[PDB]
Amino acid sequence: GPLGSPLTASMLASAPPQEQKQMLGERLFPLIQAMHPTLAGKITGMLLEIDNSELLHMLESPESLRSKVDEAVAVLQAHQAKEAAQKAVNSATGVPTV
Amino acid sequence: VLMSKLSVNAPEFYPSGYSSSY
């Protein structure tokens, strides 16, 4: 039923051919998963500004790893925030009828 | 001080290694 320990290794081999790096993006979800500041799944989409080859390098090196992920937390928290595009508080509800 | 980061808020997260070439 429910997923216990969301593993990234087995997660990869847990999806069809082309569904390789489909789920956990390239390699950021695994890295962000480690931190989980804002949202691993969504954070990944943002860091995805680089080549799949760069994210691999960072994943094998904390130096570049945190470099990109860390930034994510700052940027995304700012850019990737709550969509304030909601309705106005001055919305007429009561219709002045007879 | 409102400087951008290394990993901006790029698009969504898709299959990076989409190696579906047969």
Coordinates of C-alpha atoms in Angstrom, one line a residue:
Chain A
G1 CA 0.0 0.0 0.0
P2 CA 1.7 3.2 1.2
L3 CA 5.4 3.8 0.5
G4 CA 7.7 3.3 3.5
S5 CA 11.2 4.4 2.7
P6 CA 11.2 6.2 -0.7
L7 CA 14.4 4.9 -2.1
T8 CA 15.9 6.7 -5.1
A9 CA 18.0 3.8 -6.4
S10 CA 15.2 1.3 -6.6
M11 CA 12.9 4.1 -7.6
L12 CA 14.7 4.4 -10.9
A13 CA 14.6 0.7 -11.6
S14 CA 11.0 0.9 -10.5
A15 CA 9.8 2.6 -13.8
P16 CA 9.7 1.5 -17.4
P17 CA 12.5 2.3 -19.9
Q18 CA 12.0 5.9 -20.8
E19 CA 10.7 6.4 -17.3
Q20 CA 14.2 6.3 -16.0
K21 CA 15.0 9.8 -14.8
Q22 CA 11.4 10.7 -15.4
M23 CA 10.1 10.6 -11.8
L24 CA 13.0 11.9 -9.7
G25 CA 14.1 14.4 -12.4
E26 CA 17.7 14.0 -13.2
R27 CA 19.6 13.7 -9.9
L28 CA 18.3 16.7 -7.9
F29 CA 15.3 15.1 -6.2
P30 CA 17.7 12.7 -4.5
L31 CA 20.0 15.6 -3.4
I32 CA 17.1 17.8 -2.4
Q33 CA 15.4 14.8 -0.7
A34 CA 18.4 14.8 1.6
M35 CA 17.5 18.4 2.6
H36 CA 13.8 18.7 1.8
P37 CA 13.7 22.5 2.4
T38 CA 10.7 23.6 0.2
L39 CA 9.8 20.6 -1.9
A40 CA 12.1 17.9 -3.4
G41 CA 9.9 17.1 -6.3
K42 CA 9.3 20.7 -7.2
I43 CA 12.9 21.9 -6.3
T44 CA 14.2 19.5 -8.9
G45 CA 12.2 21.2 -11.7
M46 CA 13.9 24.4 -10.9
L47 CA 17.5 23.2 -10.5
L48 CA 16.8 21.5 -13.9
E49 CA 18.3 24.6 -15.5
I50 CA 21.5 22.6 -16.1
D51 CA 22.5 19.6 -18.2
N52 CA 21.7 16.1 -16.8
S53 CA 25.5 15.7 -16.8
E54 CA 26.1 18.6 -14.3
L55 CA 23.7 17.3 -11.7
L56 CA 25.4 14.0 -11.8
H57 CA 28.7 15.6 -11.0
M58 CA 27.3 17.4 -8.0
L59 CA 25.5 14.3 -6.7
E60 CA 28.9 12.7 -6.5
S61 CA 30.5 15.8 -5.0
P62 CA 29.0 17.6 -1.9
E63 CA 30.9 20.7 -3.0
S64 CA 28.9 21.3 -6.1
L65 CA 26.0 19.4 -4.7
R66 CA 25.1 21.8 -2.0
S67 CA 26.2 24.7 -4.2
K68 CA 23.2 24.1 -6.6
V69 CA 20.7 22.7 -4.1
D70 CA 21.5 25.3 -1.5
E71 CA 20.8 28.0 -4.0
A72 CA 17.5 26.3 -4.8
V73 CA 16.3 26.8 -1.3
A74 CA 17.0 30.6 -1.6
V75 CA 15.8 31.1 -5.2
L76 CA 12.8 28.8 -5.2
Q77 CA 11.7 30.0 -1.8
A78 CA 11.6 33.4 -3.4
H79 CA 10.6 32.7 -7.0
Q80 CA 8.8 29.4 -6.4
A81 CA 6.5 30.6 -3.7
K82 CA 2.7 30.7 -3.1
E83 CA 0.7 31.9 -6.0
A84 CA -0.8 35.1 -4.7
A85 CA -3.0 35.2 -7.9
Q86 CA -6.1 34.6 -5.8
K87 CA -9.4 36.4 -5.8
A88 CA -9.8 39.9 -4.3
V89 CA -11.1 40.4 -0.8
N90 CA -13.5 43.0 -2.1
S91 CA -15.8 40.6 -3.9
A92 CA -19.5 41.4 -3.7
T93 CA -21.4 38.5 -2.2
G94 CA -24.8 39.9 -1.2
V95 CA -26.9 41.0 -4.2
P96 CA -28.9 44.2 -3.5
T97 CA -32.3 42.8 -4.6
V98 CA -35.9 43.3 -3.5
Chain B
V1 CA 21.3 42.0 -1.9
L2 CA 18.4 40.6 -4.0
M3 CA 20.8 38.6 -6.1
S4 CA 19.7 35.5 -8.1
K5 CA 20.9 32.0 -7.2
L6 CA 22.9 29.4 -9.1
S7 CA 19.7 27.3 -9.8
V8 CA 17.0 29.8 -10.8
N9 CA 13.4 28.7 -10.8
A10 CA 13.7 27.0 -14.2
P11 CA 10.7 25.0 -15.7
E12 CA 9.4 21.8 -14.1
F13 CA 11.3 18.5 -13.5
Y14 CA 11.2 16.1 -16.4
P15 CA 13.1 12.9 -17.5
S16 CA 16.7 14.3 -17.8
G17 CA 18.1 11.1 -19.1
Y18 CA 15.3 10.5 -21.6
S19 CA 17.3 8.0 -23.5
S20 CA 14.4 6.5 -25.5
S21 CA 16.4 6.2 -28.7
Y22 CA 16.1 2.7 -30.2

